[PDB]
Every structure is written in structure tokens, then in C-alpha cells.
Amino acid sequence: LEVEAKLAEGRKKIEVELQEALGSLEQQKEDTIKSLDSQISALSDDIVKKVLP
Amino acid sequence: KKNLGRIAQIIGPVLDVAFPPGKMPNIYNALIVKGRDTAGQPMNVTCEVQQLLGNNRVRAVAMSATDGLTRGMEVIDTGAPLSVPVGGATLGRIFNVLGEPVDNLGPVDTRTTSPIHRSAPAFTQLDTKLSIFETGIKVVDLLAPYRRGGKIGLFGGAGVGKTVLIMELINNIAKAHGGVSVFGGVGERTREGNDLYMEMKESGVINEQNIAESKVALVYGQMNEPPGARMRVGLTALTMAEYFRDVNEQDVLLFIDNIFRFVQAGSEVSALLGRMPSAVGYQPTLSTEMGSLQERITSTKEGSITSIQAVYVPADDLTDPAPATTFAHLDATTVLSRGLAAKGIYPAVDPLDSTSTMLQPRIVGEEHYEIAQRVKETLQRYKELQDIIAILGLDELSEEDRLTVARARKIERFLSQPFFVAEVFTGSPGKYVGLAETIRGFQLILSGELDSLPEQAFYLVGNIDEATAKAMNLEMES
Amino acid sequence: KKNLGRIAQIIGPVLDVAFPPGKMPNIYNALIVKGRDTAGQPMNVTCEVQQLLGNNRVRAVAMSATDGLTRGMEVIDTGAPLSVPVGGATLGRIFNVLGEPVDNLGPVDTRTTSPIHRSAPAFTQLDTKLSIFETGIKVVDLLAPYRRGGKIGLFGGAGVGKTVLIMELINNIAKAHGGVSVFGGVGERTREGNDLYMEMKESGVINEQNIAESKVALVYGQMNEPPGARMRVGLTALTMAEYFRDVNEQDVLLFIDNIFRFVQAGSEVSALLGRMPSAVGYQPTLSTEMGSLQERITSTKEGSITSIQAVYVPADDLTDPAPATTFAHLDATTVLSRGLAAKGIYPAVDPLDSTSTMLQPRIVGEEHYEIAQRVKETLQRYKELQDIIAILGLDELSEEDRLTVARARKIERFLSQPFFVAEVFTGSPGKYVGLAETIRGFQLILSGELDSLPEQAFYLVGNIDEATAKAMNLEMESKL
Amino acid sequence: YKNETIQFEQQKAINQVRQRVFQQALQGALGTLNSCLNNELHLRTINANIGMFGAMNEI
Amino acid sequence: VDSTASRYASALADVADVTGTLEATNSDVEKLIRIFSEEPVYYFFANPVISIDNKRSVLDEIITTSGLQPHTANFINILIDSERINLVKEILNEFEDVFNKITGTEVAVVTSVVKLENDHLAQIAKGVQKITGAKNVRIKTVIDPSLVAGFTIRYGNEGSKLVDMSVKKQLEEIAAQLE
Amino acid sequence: RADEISKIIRERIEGYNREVKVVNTGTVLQVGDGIARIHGLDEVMAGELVEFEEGTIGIALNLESNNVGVVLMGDGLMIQEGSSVKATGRIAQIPVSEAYLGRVINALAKPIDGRGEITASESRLIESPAPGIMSRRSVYEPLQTGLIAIDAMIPVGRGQRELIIGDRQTGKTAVATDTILNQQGQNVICVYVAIGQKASSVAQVVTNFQERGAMEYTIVVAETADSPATLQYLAPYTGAALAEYFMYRERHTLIIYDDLSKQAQAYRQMSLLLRRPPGREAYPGDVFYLHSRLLERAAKLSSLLGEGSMTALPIVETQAGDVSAYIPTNVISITDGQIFLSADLFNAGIRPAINVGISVSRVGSAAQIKAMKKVAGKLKLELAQFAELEAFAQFASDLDKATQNQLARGQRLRELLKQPQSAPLTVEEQVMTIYTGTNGYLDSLELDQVRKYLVELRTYVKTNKPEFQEIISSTKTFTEEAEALLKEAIQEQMERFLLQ
Amino acid sequence: IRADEISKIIRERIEGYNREVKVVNTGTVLQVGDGIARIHGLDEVMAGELVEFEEGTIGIALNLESNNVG
Ligand SMILES: Nc1ncnc2c1ncn2[C@@H]1O[C@H](COP(=O)(O)OP(=O)(O)OP(=O)(O)O)[C@@H](O)[C@H]1O
């Protein structure tokens, strides 16, 4: 009985911690893409001149 | 300017459309023929590009009648697949294959349209939450529990009770169901359709005033609509259901009745389109046309579609390719038999053959699992002894054999339930009996407390104590 | 060879190739398509002209995988039906359809060759001696004796034991037979081919250490190969054995397996070549195809081809056309029944369905004929009273009825035998049984001297003395 | 698992924005390339490439 | 190709080959194409309801007026007799490429933004001959503005085999970074 | 850091402008329901991939006289008539590497798990030749499944194609899944191929794998019912390619086609859409060759190839218990013995529902260890004989003590073979169980206490005496020593059971 | 894609078309495989008449068709 209740609770906890970690990785990834958007403005500057052979 | 072309050949629903060299439409682009009738221009004739015949012409099938189209009429191409209105506006209405309202009321707001051919959800957008769901049918809740978000099939012949069974499932579940239902009828009786609409109005589900709050949307391509229509009414109903699921993130019910008419419509279409026939008469793309429907139904992370699809088995032959291909798709199949219906045990589901995937102990509980397996055991033993007892009689069996036979009779009769939509045939009220009564009643039956009881008292009773009371009433009839 | 044709259509293994107007190959003339392997090197694939269809176009099937070929490649008409190395050069060697060596040793001594397609012997050549040889198997040598210098056919569904029974017939007959054997494998699992190869390796019959001392030459038309090889390897092994019988005039053994894979590949290729379908799915050229094979496999005055071949029947049904056409060409037939296979009675030779032409009084001895007749009669009485029993109970039969029922079940048990090669399947070692031993044991069984011994004592037992010993051991185990 | 998954997916997002910026580079390339007189320069370049095609013909 | 049209065209052209009236019937069918190109000519000659008698009559009048080879007028009457007249345009079209495969005249399609000089035409023609192995090459003139700056010349039995550098370079350097 | 990778990219594109190679390219005449004819392409090989302008992979199968028959690997919607199609110069290659372990992938060896693309160096042909006669050796290793019936009576050895045939809902997928997830500590490579199955059913299998831990060493090449016919047809070949890449590199492999009848249906569809003529039941003539070219790439390679191995457990489906059907008879002819799963035995409580009477194993006792061979050589024959006798001993009313004792021991043997779900039995437990049964100890106690006494006996030996485990593992032979230990254990635990 | 149109019979018809004449003296071999043969000409042959090719291989005219003889 004790392991049943506590393990239901434990698997619930594991899945909701999975969802929290997922949200955190999502927000971090989006921030990195925006910083990359600034870096890639610099990239857009330094590409078009060489793209023409 | 939408490109325009001429009609080359008309042979049944096949419409051969010649187009300019430049812009031939893609597959499934709804070709709208201008259309001419007795007087006036019925633009209603809508097709679907199915092939590219080469030499700047294409082949399409007609979602309406073709009698009246003459050679040299023009076509327009809408550049997109045939779209249908969706959303809150479509809640509480009757529709066509063309997304055209039939319910004798105003039009629908075309703000959010959805094409019919939308690719299935990917592998990351599934859900593996195994879950039971009771319906109040003793046998359905016991021997083959139903699943949430997953398909269910009422395999059976004709006249054995698929429509009555699905109507009773409607009245049980949908009335208290916490989301939306989408009843889509792929080629069933227009009388059944009208009567269902009448019940939806009498009970008030589609509120005649305030039609926006109705939680039920109907799509009807009946048994007289052309095979071009009865092959895509299903897809229309499915697009409505999956729009609800994808956007509003709800639990949707989708009652298809019944997909074999869709399969047969496909057969009649392909035979005229000139493909080489596969087994006995079907199209070669049968598994693919089946899956292209069955796979856009599955429950996703945002919403869940628990569709109950009746399936019609031709000539009582489960070996036929259409049921033998739908079995691979459905989760829990309820095989209605004709023998049980003849001997009167209604509903006439076959307790052995009706097999689920959710009937697992780590899903349902070991007590339910044990009692279900024991019922299947005793019924299997009876089915085995049936051949011997046909010739001889119950007189010449052993002691355990006679005990198992008597228990089997009592089981197969206790497995019956009077329905709320069967009161016009039995006269006995409906009897809703959930799993809490079901498991205990069968536990008593396979324990043997009711061994001294007669058999006829379990016939058409909900509760096990209802059967006991009727038994004491049978002994009260001396 | 001079004339150069261009590949025009390839629908899988069907190659329609166009030639210059005047130089058109003959039917069955081999074609060498100049291919190109995926590494850029050429890939020579052989073909065989099946049908001249006009417009300078012939239809040739591919003996090898066509994947990688293209339209417009070169082809060259070698003018001859497929030439296979023949003679003593091929002894102890593993081959393919084209006579190529695939045992991965030195190439074959190309000195002698012979075209695969040829004609049957005339009506004069037919050798007529009706004489049986002993195979060591009880049910075989009692109810369906095999005809030396004849044809023996085995029927059965898949998983019943005809491959293993050919293995058994090999292990008994082949090595002791002073003559030369040839094993033809038509549509055979690579596992079973390799098993045969390594078992004959260990058994010394090939004598690897000194090649060209062997007595067996192996051909292998495997199952992975396209329909051309499965159509031609039976004829290949036949042409080898035919050289052996004619030029070397020594008694040959020809194990063909299967014979139905021949007609399988035939029906596969037929629909594409332009023919209309026959019955259940076979080709129109069925009876003449199997006749062309069988009437070439025969015994003449010079040499005698004793040929065992297994006919795999589909779905256990003997009404299929290819089994139906084999029966008329096979002298002594033995059908395996999935029922006898299920009840563990192995070998599962159906005693009532299987018949032989050798089982005649004058041919095999009066007492042997009569004992065979009594075995058949008793088993038939059992299988007739079967359902009478099954619905009445056993008590309500007469004394004679119950007696013959018990003795028939005892015969049915005794017809089983531990095989040398089936040791892996049973667990007990094999038992070669002599014909006289079989006859005597069945005389005892029908006369009823063992008529209180347990049934399971007659199970997996060679001789009746071994059966009595087993009964005594069980009688000890019972009280102990 | 989610850590390595988001690492892979972030790399794919870098690939995505790379695709988009390189699309912009190609559009600006075509915009500058719309010079018809430079096409004639590209025509003499493609004459040199006809010479190179003769070289490949030799190969 | 086993197209029945190609069968008849091959028969006609091969009769022309074994006689020596090759160009004389080449011009003949070259004009027959433009005869049948106008629709009522083909419709009249093809629809079977019209009597074969007056069909042949009008065909003989056209023979006399426009001028046809003996064997070629014979061949057209052979078609009108054996009822392949639904395939007349197709036969006249397959005659062209069967005669080209007879003379080894590999007709090639070169495609650029603007016209090239006949010096470039001779360059590409000699290149196509040294890759093909033909007896002769006749280059067709085309312009394709969908190309940006380059040439994509076609050869082979059909226009199957192709070499190209205008926008193939664009999409192939697309795919490198879009790996 | 963001720009320097684009720097290497631009030094690439400077050296990457154009390379003049002659590509075969013709036009498109017919496009319908996955099948598209081609005009031209006179130099495209048989089976060579093509590229439609949209970017759709294809395969050219029918090289007809005028046109080319090209099947589509994908949808056929965006393809336009008259557009160009370009030959690729490759033949059905598949990128393969060790990274695939743990990935659910499409038939194009592309991931659908959302874990980003798989890095692969080598590329192997979808259609590949089989190892020759001399390039294999006989089967001698055992492949452990975990079920007592399968691993005792009808053994499956490493490199034996064993067909799991059976009706619907009889436990075929469960048998294959248990065979897979039993392999955690045996160092094999599993490959689960699903052809024409529910996306959700595939997801259930994958989640079960992920929670049981068997995902580390397992690829799941899955296709759903919406997948095009060419993809459903080529799925098992790609799975077999992934398997063969390890099989050659001295690994041990296990692949499960589940199921084959859906692939045969996909090939029937694509052949009937290529307008080829149909044979019996509208199948093309060569579905036999179709299945054989796939299955006969399972083998136990010789010593001069590293003794690699690949065992195929293909699953088929008898519609309505009929083995006489065309595809079932073909596959029971092709494979190396089969395993029949009967719905009647599933109903009547005998799980797994292994109908032994029509089950076979062509490798035989050569796929067991010496211990289980010594304890159960005659087991399948005697169990078949006892099935006969128990079937026959009801016609006769009265019987003697010897027949009744054989009958009772046969029923105890039937109680032995019952095996629950996801409960694997190691070889030690299997040997001791077969011993305790076949000797004749179990006849005294009754059929309801059989299973529980077996559980208690196994727990008792595992607690008390680990030298039985040690013997059966290290020595692999059922020595008189281990037999004496096991008999002591049976006696002691039988007395204790009588007490309890 | 039709029988009797072999691109050589058309050639000889182009050579000698003038009017429709008998051919029963001669007959070419158009298609031959698996024991049959289609023969153009023999316009006066009877149904069942033993026809004889080169090399002495006899035949029988069973299926007389539009322009050929099976
Ligand atoms: N609980 C019940 N009691 C008595 N009769 C029943 C019951 N359920 C179903 N039936 C019988 O079923 C018959 C009609 O079955 P139903 O229309 O539901 O199936 P169907 O004919 O297959 O439907 P469809 O053809 O539209 O799929 C009625 O005649 C009715 O007598």
C-alpha cells in the first residue's frame, strides 16, 4: 500500500519535473536564438559580398 | 484569374477535364464545374482531381450528380483542396460533403475554413496515456473496456444492432460528456439521420435557440448521395473534429456510421477510374485509403478524439478485406454476431471475439482482469462443448462439464442489458449498470451463489440484485 | 556472338532486347548482357531467350539480379543453350545455375561442357527391370518400397518432414551406394544447403583433402535467386546426372529438392512473358514443363537414374495442379500428413494414401505383399470406425472391433522411427531397421502376441525386440 | 535525455536562422545581379565555361 | 520505341533508306505535318463515318496538287486502308526522329538567357559530337529567361541526358548550407 | 563563433560552385495515386532513385519501351505535369551507423523522434545479396526468449528465421516484444520494424521499451497506415540493412518484422498500380520471391567473417485461423520453422497460446544448451503424444493406472508451460522447472498449486543455493552435481509446501 | 503495339501495294514462342490445314485471325 501511493506520487513528480525542465530548456533556447539573431545580423553583413563568385 | 478548361469525357462520376498546357491543378484540387440544370447555373457541382492523365488533361470525381453535364462545359480550379467551415460557428448544424448547410437555417461564417486533406499528426504529437472509460454496457465495460482518445469498432452484419448500439452509446456518454461530439454519417439511412436530429432537438442538445451552444455538429452524406460524396463525407466530419481538437484543445467524440460505406464508395469510384481491381472487388489503394482516415483521428498532446466507428461486415464474412483491414486499425472491436441476435440475447455482441487492448491488469486492476479472464474461460469451454451437445443434448456430459455448461448459460444471459433506446422493442426500461455492479455480479455468478437459480431470470436485467428480484418474482409465479 | 543487341525493356527479370534485322537468336540461346557493377566495373549477367516476339525483339528472362541494369546496354548471343561443365571435373563441387563454381575453390575444368536443354531418350532406351532396394525405413520398405532405377516422389506441406526424410534417405543409401550421386537443390534455404554441405564434409563422402575422389556433385538453386535460376537449376543437375548415366554408364542417385519450386518460378515469370493465366495461378505451360523435366529424368539401358524428389504441396491440398501433375510421373509416392506430424508420429508417411508400383506379390514376395495389405486394411478399419468411436464411446464396439482398433493404434505408433539425422529433434539416436525385421515385427503385431504391451512402448522404436525391452523398462518404472 | 535533445534542437535552430540569412543573401545577390551588362560579363564567363566543357569532353 | 506510330514511321523511313529518296520524302512528310496540323484536315481524314471511297478521292487530289513521293503517297493510302488514321500526326512526328537516328543527326537543344554567336554554336556542336559519337549534329535555337546566366544543352535519345550551369549551381550551393 | 562556421561554409561554397556531370532528365506524363510515369530517362538504371522538382524521392522500377515507371516515396500532391525529373546516380542507399541505437526512424533512415538527425558515415544498399552457402556456418548458439515453451520445446537459435504466425490479438506482438526486452544483458542488437500499424500502437511499444530500459540497444523502424505504399514496402529492407551492418561487424542481431502481411499488401497495391497482372487473390506472382529475398538475409556467418549473426522473427497474420491462405503458406514455406499462436488456446487460459502440435523448429535441440537438451530432449514428442492420448482417452471410459499417470503428468506439464506477461525465465529457472516437471514430482500436488509451488521452489533455490546458478551458467551442462542439488531442493521445498 | 505490324510487313506493303493480292504461296514467321507461331499471309489456307515451316517443323492452323494465322 505504502509503495503504491508513494510511487504514484513519485511518477507524478517525475513527469511534472520533466515538464518544468522542458519549459526551462525552451526559454533558454529562445534566448539563445535571439542573441544568435543579433550575431546573424552581423552574419548578414559579412556574407553577401563573398556569396558572389 | 483562376485557370479554366473544358470537360472531355463524362462516364458516371468520372469527369475528364482538359486544361490549358500551362496550369494543371494538383491532386485533390476542387474543380468547380459551372454546372447547368433545367434552368439556371448550378455551380454546386464540385470535383476533386484524382489523376493526371497527361496531354494537358486530368481526371476528377464528382461530389454531386453528373446527369446534366454536357461536353464542352467550363471548369474553374480553386487552387486549393476542398475546404469546409469549422469553429464555433459550425457548432449545432447539419452539413454536406461540400460543407454546405442543410439544416434549413442561415449560412456559416467562412472566417476559418479548413481543407479536407490535412496530413496526419507526427510521432511527437501523440499521447500514450492508457485509460479506461465505462459506457454502462455490462459486456463492453467487462470483457473489452473502452479507451480514451482511441478508436472503437462495432463490427457486425446487417440488422444485428450496430445503429441501436451506437445510439445507446450516444445517450449514455454524449449527454454527460464534457466536450463536444461530432456525429458524422457516411451513408446510413436518412431516416436514422432525421430521427437522431429529432432526438437531439427533443432532448435539447442542439438548442433551437442559442445554436452556438450545442456541443454537437452533424455531417450527413446519406445512402443516396453519389459515390463521390460518400467517399469524402467522412473526411469532412473528421476535419471538423480535428479542428476542434487542434485549436480548442478539447475532448471530442466522433461517431462514424459507418466506414464500410466509405470503403465501398472508394471501390465504386476506383472501378470507374479504371484502376485494376484488387481482391474480390475493392480498390488496390484500400489499406492506404483506410489509413488516410484512421490516422488523423488519434489523440494528441493538446486534445483527444475518442471516435466510435461502426463497421459493417459484408455477408457476415469477417474474412473480407475491408473489415480485415479495419481490425488492424481499431483499438477495441465489438463483434456483433447474428446467432446471438437470433436466439434473442441483446445486445448481440460476441463476448469471446470482442477483444480489446485496454484489457490489461496494469490498466484495469487485477480483480477486473481475473473475473474477465474467468468469464472468457467458461464461455470458451461452452463453445467447445457446443458441437457435442448439438447432436446429443446436455444429458451426456460429465459433472464438471454440466456445471460449466449451466454456468455458461447463466453468464451469457446475465451479459444482456435492456437499453434506453430499446424500450420501443422490449418494453422494459433501460438499465445502466457500471463496473462496480458488473464485477461483483459476475463474481457471484462464477462463485456459484446463484447456482440454485433458474436461467430466464437473468434475461434482460441490469443489476445482479435485479436478476435476484426477478428470480424471486418467477418463484412468485408459483 | 558477333550480333549486338540493345536492352529495350526490363520489367524486373523480363528483358525484351532488340537485335539487328537478320541476326536473331534461337529459342533458349543464352545472352550475356554487358552490365555495370555499382563500383563502375562491368557486371556480366546471363539471360536465356524465351520467346521471339517479332520486330527484331526477343524476350529473355534473367538468370541473375537485374537491379543495376539499364536500357540500351550491350548483349551478345552466345548461340548455345546454357553450357554447364560436365564429367568428373564437377565431382565434389558446389555449383549454380550457370555451372559456375561457388564452393570458393579453383575454377571448374572447362574441358567438357554440355548444353542444358536437350531431348529425352527414345522409347527403345527405356530399361525395364522392376526391382526394389532397401532404404532402412520401416514404413517405406513395408508399404511403399522404392524402385531402383526409377523415380520416387515425396509430398507434404511445409514443416512435415520431407527435407529431413531426404536427409535420412541420403544417410542410408548414398555412401553405401558404390555409384555416383548428384544433389539438385531447387529453391532451398541456404541454411539447409550449408548443413548438407558440412554434413557430407564430415561424412567423408566428398573427401576435401583429395578432390575429384568424391561421389557427389552439388547444385544449388537457392531461394534468394530470381526466377531464372530457380527455373534452370533442376535442368542443370539433370544434365550433370545425364552425362553421368550415359557416358559413364554407372547407376546414379538424383536428389531433387524441391520440384515445386520449378513450377513456382515458372508461374512467377509466366504472367509477364505474355501468357494468359491457367487455373489457381499457374502458367499454361505447366504439364509440358513438368513432363519435359520428368521424361528426361529416367533410366535407360546404359545408365540408371534412381531419382528421389520432394514435391512441396501448398496448403496441404493435393488438388493443386503441380502436385496433380507430379503424381502421374512419379513411380512410388509417399505423402506426409500434418496429422501424423502433429501426433508426433515421425516419419509422418500416410500409410493409407501413399502407394507404390513395386508393391506387387510377384515383385516383392508373397508374405511381404500380404503383410503390407493387412497393415493397410487395419489402418483403414481404424480410420473408418474413428468417428463411430468418437461419438459412441469405445465400450460399445465388438470384441473384434476394439481388438483391431488397439492393434491399429499400435501399428500407427510402431510406424514411427528415430532417425539418425532427426536425433537433434527427438533426442534418441537413430535405428536402421531391416526389411525382414519390419515384416516380422508387423506379423507379430497383427497376430497379437504383444497384445497387452503398452502403446507408448511401440513409440520411437526400431525393432520389435527393442519394443519389448522398452515395455519391460516401463513395467519396471510403473511399479517403481 | 531532454538536455541532449534541446542541444540538438538548438543546433537545428542555428541551422534554421542560417538558412534564412542565406536566403536573404541570395535575394540580395539576385538584386545586384539584375545588372544586364554584368550578365554579358557572365556571358564571357560562360564562354570560358564552354571551354571548360570542352575540357570535360576531353576528360 | 515500340509506339505503333514509330513502327510505321520506321518502315517508311527504312524504305526511303533502301531506295535513296531520303531527303525527297523528308521534305514530303515535313509538308504533310503542316497539312494535317490544321484541324479540319485531320478531322475529315480520321472520322470513320466518311466513306473510304471519297476519302481516297480527296487524298488523291491532294497528292496531285501538293506533290508526294510515289512510296509516300503509297504509304498514306496504306494507312487509310489499314485504319491507323487516328495516328497520322503521331506517325508524321516519329518520322522526324527516326530519320534523325538514321542519319545520326542528333538534334540538340541549347538554352541560355540571350543568343550565342554561331562560334559558340559550333563549339557546343563539336562538343556534343565528341560526347555522343554521332555522324552529324544540328543545334536548335532556344532562349530561357528562367536561367540566370548560363547554358544548359540537351542531347541523347530523348532530351534525357542534360548538362547545365545556370540555376543548378544556385540550388546546389543552396543545398550545401541547407544540409 | 556564429560567423566562423559560416566562414568555413563560404570557403566551401567558393570551392563549391558547379561540377559538370551529365544528369539524365526527362518529363512527366502520368501522375496518379503514388505512381508517376516518366517520359525519357533512357539511361536510368533499374531501381535508381530519381528527384522530382518538388523534391520527392522516387524509384524507377518499370523501364518500359516508351515511358519509365517510377513509384513515389511520399505524397503525390505538389508534383506538376511536364516538370523535370532528374536521375540521382544512386541505388536505394541508406546511411547507417551505431548512433541509430535508440531511435524511431522513418523508412528513409530519417528520425521521427525529434532528437535531431543521426550522424552516419557508411551507406548500404536497401536490396543486398545474401551470404552464400560457404559464407555461413550451422546454428549452434541459443537465442534466449524467456518463455518456457519457446525456449524449451521449439528452440530459436542465433541466426534462425522463426515465424511468429497467429490470429489477431493472440499475443504475437507480445511474444516478439518479450523476446526483445529479455535481451538486456545478453549483448544483442534488437531492431523492431512496424509496417502499417497505428501511430499510437507504435508509441505504446516505444514507451514500453523506454520504461523497461530496452531502448538503449534497439532501433524502431516504424511506419504508420498513412505511409505511402513504397515506404510500407521498403521498411523491412531498410531494417534488414541496419541489422546487416552490425551482423557483418561481428555483432549479434535480432530483427522483428511486425507484420509481414501488411508489407505484402503494400507490394500488392503498388504492383496493381503499376498495372502488372495479378495472381491468386490479386497478389503479384512473386510475393514468394519478395519475402524470400528479405528473409534469407538472416544467417549465422562463418568464422572467416567474424561469426556475426542475425535472427529474424517475422510476424504474419492468419485471417480467421486459416494457414492455407496464400501469404501464410508462402511464409511457412520460406522460414525456418514457425510458432503458431491459436486464439482457442488464448481464450482457454493457456498464455502464451503456443499451439505446439503444429509448431516446429528446424534447428532443433542445437539451439539449446547441454542442460536443457539433457532434461528435455524428448519433451515435444512426448507432449504431442500426451495431447493425442488426452484427446483420445475420453472415448474410452475406464483406464489403467499407467495411462492415468501419463495423463496426470501431461496435465502437470501443461500447467508448467503457462507463462505470464513480461515475466522472463532465465536458463537456470528453465532447466530446474523442466526437471521438476518431467521427472514426476509434480503429479502429487494439484493443478491449482502447480504454479505457486513452482514460484516457491525457484525462489527457494535462488535464496539457498547459488551454486546451481553457477553450474548452469559457467559449465552450461546439467551435471549430476547440480541434479543432486536440485533433487535436495525439490524434496525440502515439497515438504515445506505440504506443511504450508 | 499491335500484331501483324512488324515494321517489315509494312515495308513490303509499301513496296508492292498496288491492290490487294493473294499471298497463299508464302508466309513469313512473325512471332514464335512456347509452341505457337503467328504467320502472316496464307490467305487461302483452311482452318486446320497442316502448314510446314522451314526445318521440317510441321504446324496446324487453328486460330486464323485478321491478318495472321495462329
Ligand atoms: N437491446 C435490444 N433489444 C432488442 N432488439 C435490439 C436491441 N438492440 C438492437 N436490436 C435490434 O437491432 C435491429 C436494428 O439494428 P441496427 O439498426 O442497430 O443495426 P444495423 O441494422 O446494422 O444498422 P445499420 O444498418 O444502420 O448499420 C432492430 O430490429 C432491433 O430489434
Ligand SMILES: Nc1ncnc2c1ncn2[C@@H]1O[C@H](COP(=O)(O)OP(=O)(O)OP(=O)(O)O)[C@@H](O)[C@H]1O
Ligand atoms: N502470457 C501472457 N499473460 C497475460 N496476458 C497476455 C500474455 N500474452 C499475451 N497477453 C495479452 O494478449 C493481448 C494481445 O497481445 P498482442 O498485443 O500481441 O496482440 P496482437 O496479436 O499483437 O494483436 P495484433 O496482431 O492485432 O496487434 C495483450 O493485451 C496481452 O496483455
Ligand SMILES: CC(C)C[C@@H]1NC(=O)[C@H](C)N(C)C(=O)CNC(=O)/C(=C/c2ccccc2)N(C)C1=O
Ligand atoms: C437511369 C439513371 C440511372 C440515370 C443515370 N443516373 C445515375 O446513375 C446517377 C444519378 N449518376 C451517378 C449520375 O449522375 C449519372 N451517371 C450515371 O451513373 C448514369 C448511369 C446510367 C447507366 C445506364 C443506364 C442509365 C443510367 N447516367 C447515365 C444517368 O443519367
Ligand SMILES: Nc1ncnc2c1ncn2[C@@H]1O[C@H](COP(=O)(O)OP(=O)(O)O)[C@@H](O)[C@H]1O
Ligand atoms: N524423423 C523425425 N522425427 C521427429 N521430427 C522430425 C522428423 N523429421 C522431421 N521432423 C521435424 O520436422 C521439422 C521440419 O521438417 P522438414 O524436413 O523441414 O519438412 P519440410 O521440408 O516439409 O518443412 C523439423 O523441425 C523436425 O523437427
